[PDB]
């Protein structure tokens, strides 16, 4: 039976090409990463642009809120991950994560972990409590890893989608995928 969803437009933000969007859990904010290398925070209640981060001159393909730390984590085509405090607009940290474009960032919901996927065919786990050390590298995709998502029911598992035509499900703590779809 057709679900009668009342679809209302809350915000319309015209900008350059948006490559990632994220929603803040407590604040009425939308994060938008742009192809021009900027990251914008929109308030969807006031319909106003609240914050803008100029990351680099290159496309920012991934951006995520880390609400518990007051951070915005960005991954750009310059192979750099940049961490910004969204209150002070200060750059907290910056490091080279991958040898090619960063496609996706997944933030672990409870642990101090960020997963990053890249066109280098790798997925890397970063621990921010250990000075952003790479704790693990996941190898096994044969093409660009376009998106990664943590299992909301089992935060030790995540899935990856790749241009190799495969989906791999991985476990934190395993260098090999649990299975391939």
């Amino acid at each position: 039976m057709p679900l009668r969803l009342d679809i209302k437009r809350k915000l319309t933000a015209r900008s350059d090409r948006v490559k990632s969007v994220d929603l803040h859990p407590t604040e009425p904010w939308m994060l938008a990463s742009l192809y021009n290398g900027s990251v914008c925070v929109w308030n969807h209640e006031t319909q106003t642009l609240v914050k803008t981060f100029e990351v680099c001159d290159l496309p920012v393909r991934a951006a995520k809120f880390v609400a518990r730390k007051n951070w915005v984590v960005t991954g750009a085509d310059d192979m750099q991950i940049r961490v910004f405090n969204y209150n002070t607009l200060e750059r907290v940290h910056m490091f080279e994560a991958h040898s090619d474009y960063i496609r996706c960032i997944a933030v672990h919901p409870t642990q101090p972990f960020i997963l990053t996927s890249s066109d280098d065919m790798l997925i890397k786990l970063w621990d921010w409590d250990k000075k952003w050390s790479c704790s693990q590298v996941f190898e096994g995709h044969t093409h660009y890893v376009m998106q990664i998502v943590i299992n909301p029911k089992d935060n030790n598992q995540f899935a990856s989608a790749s241009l190799d035509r495969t989906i791999k499900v991985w476990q934190l703590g395993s260098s090999s995928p649990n299975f391939t779809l």
């Binding site: 395993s174 090999s176 995928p177 649990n178 299975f179």
Partner: protein
């Protein structure tokens, strides 16, 4: 190729099915408790090992006797982290080893889950299972991690050499 029939038994959650598919597919299969048996053929050094993974649940343990016939090698898998059920694993192993149909069967014990920090070492499992009390039986204990695959091939290499010399 010489075909060898191997029975793989042990308590539930010992990781038997994980060992079987790690040997065959090279991958870690997340297994639910095996309700019944799995049968897979594993090739190692021109010997075809037909491995029977029979479930270790209390309801299935009485049914292990139906698989003893024509068994040339017995693999007993022990959860080296399960200190509470080690005595139960000893009783079940000793009960199987008393069967006349298994008299000529070579015993390989896999001390599995050695990757866990509270795992008993292979020597502690050897004493707790009483393997040193076994007379006239060729046995070997190998520390294994079914998830990494460490020690699985060393155990199979011992088994292949024993079964090659028995004819």
């Amino acid at each position: 190729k010489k075909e060898m029939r191997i029975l793989m038994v042990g308590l539930d959650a010992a990781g038997k099915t994980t060992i079987l598919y790690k040997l065959k597919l090279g991958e870690i299969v997340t297994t639910i408790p095996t309700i019944g048996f799995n049968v897979e053929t594993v090739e190692y050094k021109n010997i075809s090992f037909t491995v029977w993974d029979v479930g270790g649940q209390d309801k299935i343990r009485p049914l292990w006797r139906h698989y003893f016939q024509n068994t040339q090698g017995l693999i007993f898998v022990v959860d080296s982290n399960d200190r509470e059920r080690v005595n139960e694993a000893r009783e079940e192993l000793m009960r199987m080893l008393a069967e006349d149909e298994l008299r000529d069967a070579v015993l390989l014990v896999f001390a599995n889950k050695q990757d866990l920090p509270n795992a008993m070492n292979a020597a502690e499992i050897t004493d707790k299972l009483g393997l040193h009390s076994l007379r006239h039986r060729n046995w070997y204990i190998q520390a294994t991690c079914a998830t990494s695959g460490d020690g699985l091939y060393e155990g199979l290499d011992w088994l292949s050499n024993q079964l090659r010399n028995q004819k």
